[PDB]
Amino acid sequence: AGLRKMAQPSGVVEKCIVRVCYGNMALNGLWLGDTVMCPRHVIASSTSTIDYDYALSVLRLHNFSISSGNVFLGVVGVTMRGALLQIKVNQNNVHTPKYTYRTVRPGESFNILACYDGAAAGVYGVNMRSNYTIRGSFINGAAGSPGYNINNGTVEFCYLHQLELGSGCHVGSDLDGVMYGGYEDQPTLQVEGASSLFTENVLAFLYAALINGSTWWLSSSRIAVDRFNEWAVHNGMTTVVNTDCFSIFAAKTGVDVQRLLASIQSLHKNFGGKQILGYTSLTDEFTTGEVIRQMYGV
């Protein structure tokens, strides 16, 4: 019983973290094979607008300090890769896992390995929000911390931390160097798109709650998916687009999605009157995959 936001075990990623220093900048890099991927702002100079191409043109390879623990890696080349630098080093990471890159979509869960000075410090599950930010915990020096998923022994890398938005949203790029949400790696006054609750994740959580005995919030009314969707974009919630993933839950609980959507509306107007399984009633951080894994182990 129980529902907890957890991370997948971090052992296979921990050995891929390095410290990347250049000038007065230090952050983290991801050492796979004979390359180190790291945010390109490590070669930027001030705290103005940055011409990364110029920064790279006036770069000296001997000015990099890249280390795994107390072992230093020699830098062979640097290429720009979107918001990342691809740094070729003279040593193969013998602990490189089987890995892939994948760019995640709003609503999807992954794992942050929060790193400082080239060493993992903490690990926690997160969920890509509809405005392409994650609700994380990062302070200066965290950039380069990887986001990953582990699937059948293959590490899927989906995130390297980049910046905190003026409000404290967290933004990274994928491992091809495309910034999530299109934000710039520039110390400028950009503001995030509106944060909405990912409704499909709310549905997974409400089903989890039913399976765990939480029923006080269950409406007897029903609302069609498309009618709810029109209300949602006026009430800070995403639209429901996929419903087949809920058939398994509807069958085990006897409660269909339409009753849950009606419950969601009724929770919006006494928002905070009671918790659900200990959480705020409209929690959107759990996916159906996470719920299945924790209720049934499959």
């Binding site: 702002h41 302070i139 965290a142 950039a143 938005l165 003026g166 520039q186 110390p187 006054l189």
Partner: peptide
């Protein structure tokens, strides 16, 4: 105001 970390 964005903070590069």
């Amino acid at each position: 105001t964005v903070r590069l970390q």
